[PDB]
Design a protein around this nucleic acid. Structure first.
Lengths: 92, 92
DNA sequence: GCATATCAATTTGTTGCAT
DNA sequence: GCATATCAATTTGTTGCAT
């Protein structure tokens, strides 16, 4: 399922137009990105939570030259699945 | 940031009412879960992608008894962060 | 979140293309 | 995605409890 196919179902479920369903979904996804980036954890009950996970430098290897290198420290987006999400994917 | 706080920001950005922002967001998240559960991968450009992943059985240990046990195989919700998410969290 | 086990199995990214 | 390293810093879950 891509964004467009999701919008169709959302516009159907929420009884709104596809242009509206997209505009809201766009806003929702952009806001989650902004919030996480600003170091804020985004929690959505049932579904899950988003946060930034810190990551220190690690050793790596150049596949073309076999030469060892250091992959620099960085910040990554993370996701934790809520109870309802994990239970729909794997019922107790 | 919780759902309610996300709704407010979404309703502000998309120029819609809070009830409408919530109705869409609920539908969007509930659809995402049903799709992942039925074995479909949900891809959203910029943001990221959701999918199920199967974990094989592994050896574990009971902290209450010290007794070694086997954690059974399962399926879990997973997330891949898209380029735009990873770049707002850590700009190149 | 917190905790056992001298745990055990994930996930990713490394460069530079390619689909 | 593919092409290394007998990679390497990382997540996550055992059974429950604490907040």
């Amino acid at each position: 399922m891509n964004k467009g196919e999701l919008v169709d179902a959302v516009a159907e479920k929420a009884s709104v137009t596809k242009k509206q369903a997209d505009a809201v979904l766009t806003a929702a996804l952009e806001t989650i990105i902004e919030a996480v980036s600003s170091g804020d954890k985004v929690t959505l009950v049932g579904f899950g939570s988003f946060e930034s996970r810190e990551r220190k430098a690690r050793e790596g290897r150049n596949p073309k030259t076999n030469e060892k290198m250091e992959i620099p420290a960085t910040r990554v987006p993370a996701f934790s699945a809520g109870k309802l999400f994990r239970e729909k994917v794997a019922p107790p």
